[model samples]
Target chain A: KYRKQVINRLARIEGHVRAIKEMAAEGRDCPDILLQIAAVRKALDSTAKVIFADHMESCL
Target chain B: KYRKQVINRLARIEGHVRAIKEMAAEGRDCPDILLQIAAVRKALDSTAKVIFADHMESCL
Candidate 1:
């Protein structure tokens, strides 16, 4: 149903968020921390209308 | 067909990112900055499956 899939993803994001909170306390650099945030975000964004998946339509 | 909507959204994110960079350079608090970062990334994730939209499927 994709419901479970979304829930699992949400659960996994919390783990990253937990890591981010720990890293911030550990004094990770701004660029370093920001990139990780963006990296995870970019990965998530690519799941759908992201990654410029105009190619997807060609296949789907 | 949906490409323009996606492109527009990506552009919107870049504006937030520009704000993020400015905040970082001005020496924003780690917690505040990270929260904004998390807020944005979480927002993007919610843009798709993370928001739990099985509602759309039944309607379709």
Candidate 2:
């Protein structure tokens, strides 16, 4: 059976994404903004790996 | 002007991706396979960071 589970990790990633958008809107320094973006990228990549694990355990 | 630099980092990441596919095809151990997936993810996160830096220097 499919788990259909929604995890808090997704919410944390969503929050980070929104923070990156805010950084863009505020016209932060390019280098600093990019660093923040990179942080978000790292978070997102980790989240993706977690999701992949969850999917394999439940769906596949 | 945009640099249009297609760095080899992307290609390396792509290769890791293919390796993951092959891992699945070979019916590798799930834990070991997931670890490889994590490795690919870390590589991809680093790539994204580099791309973010490149984009700021050229596009943004």
Candidate 3:
């Protein structure tokens, strides 16, 4: 029941995290990099919501 | 309308990401670090679901 949906979103998140690592290494302003971190986190929060709704309807 | 719930969780994730950064600094194993990342991600997924369910009731 849309398990792939969660995994696929997770793959994207994995990639995003890798990019974030580089941003931090590039000596980006700590605060500036933090903003990007928040951006991805918010995206993940929404991604999780999509899967959550699916799960509730199908399983829980 | 408990906006703080979601925002508060985001605050925690920020701290988690900082730890992930330190893991990288200490040259923690890549796959090992990924596993921790996945753990945090799954936690976020659950946390987001809680807020999403609340939002659904309020909005839809």
Candidate 4:
């Protein structure tokens, strides 16, 4: 079980969140900020799905 | 412009990310982790949509 993989994914997401913060800090338009947020949310959900898939195989 | 609102939202998200990290650290079941992540992702998306809606009103 590559638990480390999920940890790494979260780390990447942490960075993404920080980048979004920076965009807001710089007063970027809400359009761009919203786009970036959507991207991050997609990544976060995908990571969780991957973990669930992996666990399904092992637990089954 | 309630830019501070989104910034505050991001801060809350940052906390959520850390909580997820802690869950992974404790070797929690993938199912629960996935659920929590889905919740976070939903919140993130909702926040972005709110920002977009506000901007729509302001920019129009």
Best by lDDT: 4
Whole-model lDDT per candidate: 0.46, 0.50, 0.55, 0.79
Chain B TM-score in each of the candidates: 0.63, 0.72, 0.73, 0.80
**Model 1 CA lDDT for position A24:** 46
Q: Per-residue lDDT tens digits of candidate 2, residues A1-60?
A: 112222344344445545544544455555654565466457546654654666576424
Task: Kindly report the TM-score of the first chain in candidate 1.
Answer: 0.59
Number of the predicted model whose TM-score against the real structure is largest:
4
Q: In candidate 2, which residue ranges exceed 4 Å CA deviation?
A: A1-60, B1-6, B57-60
Off by over 4 Å in 4: A57-60, B57-60
Candidates in descending TM-score order: 4, 3, 2, 1
lDDT, model 1, position A8: 46
Q: Alpha carbon lDDT of residue B56, candidate 3?
A: 52
The first chain of model 4 has a TM-score of 0.81
lDDT of 2 at A9: 42
- In CAPRI terms, model 4 is classed as medium
What would the per-residue lDDT of candidate 2 be over residues B1-60, giving only the tens digit for each residue? 112332344445445555544555555555655675567557656655555665656435
TM-score of chain A of 2: 0.64
Per-prediction share of native contacts kept: 0.04, 0.03, 0.00, 0.47
Task: List RMSD in Å for every model shown.
Answer: 19.8, 8.7, 12.8, 2.5
DockQ per candidate: 0.04, 0.07, 0.04, 0.53
Per-residue error (Å), model 2, residue B56: 1.9
Error of 4 at A51 (Å): 0.4
